[PDB]
Design a protein around this ligand. Structure first.
Ligand SMILES: CCOc1cc2ncc(C#N)c(Nc3ccc(F)c(Cl)c3)c2cc1NC(=O)/C=C/CN(C)C
Length: 285
C-alpha cells in the first residue's frame, strides 16, 4: 500500500518519496521511481536489475525479493540483510548500500552499480587470469575482509560471484546476505553457504573470521588456475588437507603458491589472518 524505508540506524520506518513518484498512481515506488534497464541476475531469492534512478539520473543495482514475506521471521530474516550491509559501513573495497525499502511485503535493496562480477569476468575471458590481476584482486578483497573482521563480521559467502570489478583493475566485495556479527548467536543465524568455498571447520559448526580467509583462498585459486571447485566427494576433501592439487597449480609463481597455502591452512587456529597476509612483503606497495 506504500513504500517504507528499511534501516537500523533509526528506528522509525518512514515512507519514501521521489520525483516521478506520485502515491496516487497504482504502480509501486520501484516501477515508478526507477527506469528498469535490464536484469543483472535472478534466482530463488528474487531478481537484480540494472536501473537508472529518476531522482538523480545515476545508475544503480536493485535487488527485489521474489514473493511477499511469509511471516514475521521471514520478514526479519530478509530485513536483516540491510542491517548486515549497514554494519559494514563505507570502505573503498566494499559495495556501498544506497538505500533499502519495503512495499507490499517485498524488500528492495539499492546498491551502487559496479562492473562485472569476478565470476563473469573470468567466464568471459575463458582462461586463468594473469597473475598481476590476481594479486590486485587478492589484495582488494583482503582489505575488504580486514575491514569486516576488525568489526567481528564474517561474510561467509566469499566467492567470485560476490566480488565486483571496479575501474583500473580494482574490485569490491559485496553481497552481505550471509554476513554475521560474531558474539551474537542469532537469529536466524548462519544461513548455509556454497560448499565449494566452505572452510573445513564449518562442517562441524565452527565459525569465525578464519572462514572468509579460506573462502578467498579457494576463490583466488579458482580464478588463478581456471579451475572448477568440487561440490563434495574426495575432490572436496583434497583441497582441505593442506597441500595443493598439483595439476592446475602448476602455473602459480612461488609467491602466490606460498600465500595460498597459508590461506588454505585446514586448522583455523593456524590459518593466516587477513591482517597477517596484508603484512607479507608480496602484498603491500
Ligand atoms: C555488469 C555489472 O554486473 C553486475 C553489477 C553489480 N553491481 C553491484 C552489485 C551489488 N551490490 C551487484 N549484485 C548485487 C548483489 C546483491 C544485492 F543485494 C544487490 Cl542490490 C546487487 C552487481 C551484479 C552484476 N551482475 C551479476 O550479478 C551477474 C550475474 C551473472 N549470472 C551468474 C547471473
Amino acid at each position: 500500500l506504500q513504500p517504507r524505508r528499511v534501516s537500523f540506524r533509526g528506528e522509525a520506518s518512514e515512507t519514501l518519496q521521489s520525483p516521478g513518484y506520485d502515491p496516487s498512481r497504482p504502480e509501486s515506488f520501484f516501477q515508478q521511481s526507477f527506469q528498469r534497464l535490464s536484469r543483472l541476475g535472478h534466482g530463488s531469492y528474487g531478481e537484480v536489475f540494472k536501473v537508472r534512478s529518476k531522482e538523480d539520473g545515476r545508475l544503480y543495482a536493485v535487488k527485489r525479493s521474489m514473493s511477499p514475506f511469509r511471516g514475521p521471521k521471514d520478514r526479519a530474516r530478509k530485513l536483516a540483510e540491510v542491517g548486515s550491509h549497514e554494519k559494514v559501513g563505507q570502505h573503498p573495497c566494499c559495495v556501498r548500500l544506497e538505500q533499502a525499502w519495503e512495499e507490499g511485503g517485498i524488500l528492495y535493496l539499492q546498491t551502487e552499480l559496479c562492473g562485472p562480477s569476478l565470476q563473469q569476468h573470468c567466464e568471459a575471458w575463458g582462461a586463468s587470469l594473469p597473475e598481476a590481476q590476481v594479486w590486485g584482486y587478492l589484495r582488494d578483497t583482503l582489505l575488504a575482509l580486514a575491514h569486516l573482521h576488525s568489526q567481528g563480521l564474517v561474510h561467509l559467502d566469499v566467492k567470485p560471484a560476490n566480488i565486483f570489478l571496479g575501474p583500473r583493475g580494482r574490485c569490491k566485495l559485496g553481497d552481505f546476505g550471509l554476513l554475521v556479527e560474531l558474539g551474537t548467536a542469532g537469529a536466524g543465524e548462519v544461513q548455509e553457504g556454497d560448499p565449494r568455498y566452505m572452510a573445513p571447520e564449518l562442517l562441524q559448526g565452527s565459525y569465525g573470521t578464519a572462514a572468509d580467509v579460506f573462502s578467498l583462498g579457494l576463490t583466488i585459486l579458482e580464478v588463478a588456475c581456471n579451475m572448477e571447485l568440487p561440490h563434495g566427494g574426495e575432490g572436496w576433501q583434497q583441497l582441505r588437507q593442506g597441500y595443493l592439487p598439483p595439476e592446475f597449480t602448476a602455473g602459480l609463481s612461488s609467491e602466490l603458491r606460498s600465500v595460498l597455502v597459508m590461506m588454505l591452512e585446514p586448522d583455523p587456529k593456524l590459518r593466516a589472518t587477513a591482517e597477517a597476509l596484508l603484512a607479507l612483503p608480496v602484498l603491500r606497495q
